[PDB]
Symmetry: C3
Subunit: 185 residues, 3 copies
């Protein structure tokens, strides 16, 4: 019989008050606290903390504080990852990001969600849907990436865009709900 | 013969530079500073601080740092209140929230506003309009709730929604300005 | 024969990893760290730190922590400047703001941008376009102001608005992409 963690990772309904999940969120918040307190010149300390926090990385990555996440271990980024100030990644399920990603400030990436149904939501059970972002993606500042979304290679998300569905490779999308506004290839 | 505080709470034009109001904002920011500095495992200290800061609460509530507000005492939340990372509540007038509220990260709830007219606005005088949120409401991350809005029981605010008008009970709204996208239950 | 800083300020492609630019960014973050750590009652220290950080100011200005910026010296504000909690100003190029500005919380002002082509963007070279904001402007909470935008005197930006083009004087804009929704006269 599946644990709440197994249920969470599998995209099934789970209880976030589970003791194992609580311990793991406290661990993520501890590492995030240490991260957000580092000085602007402590690059090596920052790299080390991020490689410890995330599930996987490439050689190089840089994130401006403040940063926020749920678990840490569900975040997998490619080479030369960059995220500007005040980002939030709710990584209840996997968040997999490709190489040479540029993410602007105040960007929120969500895998966490609730049942829409009033009665179901009030159970207090939640679930997640993974987010996949390809290579050479630019996510404009203040964008919102919703659970279950896949963004294709070379795509561009306009600043302030609320992305509610998959974004094709080589597309620029913007607005809310975001839609294709330009093709690059 | 009304004080600036009395005019503020009544929804009339008032001067925020008023000494009494300045002191109360200083007090809110002090409690918010103490709150934001608490460690991820300091649940009891957090509960205590929020109960001191807010006008009223139910038995249990939890907010992820960072949190910001203006006064504290104008915020009234129901049972099992949860607000995720980096929320802002500008509580110049009352913000009343029902039970079992789930609020995502980076959500802003405003009761503070200015005159549209330039001379009127440069008077420097401001005003407020209260916000009322019902029971079993889910406010998606990065939503904006404007002054004067009432959100009905069971409603869902999509991530990134900018809510400019009342939301019926059992409706799902999304967009900017938010509109009804479906009905529930 | 131009330095990366000279290309940056002139709106040309530049490399942010330039040693001079890195030094200058570290200075800005240092001063921003000192600013964000100030207590709610340290008004004089706050005023001094902002006049050090910014390119130019009027007599009086106040920003609620947290604040973020890239360089500081490209930010020029007019008399009686106010910015609420959790603002971000990416001042790769000049951000010039007039007198009596009220900026709500969580507002993002960008001058930094990337090429749309992924090979061109993957060069890692970036560029900037200045933002100009007139006098007596109200920027609603959670607005996003994109590079190259000019906002006219007495304009009002609705909360949550994503401003992708110039805003006429005496106009109210709202939405994403923002459009004029009311003329003030």
């Amino acid at each position: 019989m599946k644990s709440e963690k197994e249920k969470m990772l599998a995209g099934h309904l789970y209880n976030p008050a589970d003791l194992e999940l609580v311990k793991e969120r406290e661990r993520a918040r501890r590492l995030v606290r240490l991260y957000n307190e580092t000085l602007e010149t402590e690059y090596d300390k920052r790299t080390g903390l991020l490689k410890e926090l995330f599930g996987s990385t490439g050689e190089r990555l840089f994130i401006e504080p403040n940063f926020r996440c749920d678990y840490g271990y569900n975040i997998h980024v490619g080479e030369n990852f960059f995220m500007n100030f005040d980002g939030v990644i709710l990584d209840v399920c996997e968040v997999r990001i490709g190489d040479h990603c540029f993410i602007g400030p105040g960007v929120h990436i969500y895998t966490a969600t609730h049942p829409l149904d009033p009665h179901e939501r009030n159970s207090g059970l939640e679930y997640g849907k993974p987010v996949v972002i390809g290579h050479n993606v630019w996510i404009g500042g203040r964008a919102v990436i919703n659970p279950g979304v896949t963004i294709g290679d070379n795509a561009v998300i306009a600043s302030g865009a609320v992305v509610t569905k998959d974004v094709p490779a080589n597309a620029v999308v913007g607005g809310n709900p975001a839609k294709v506004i330009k093709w690059l290839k």
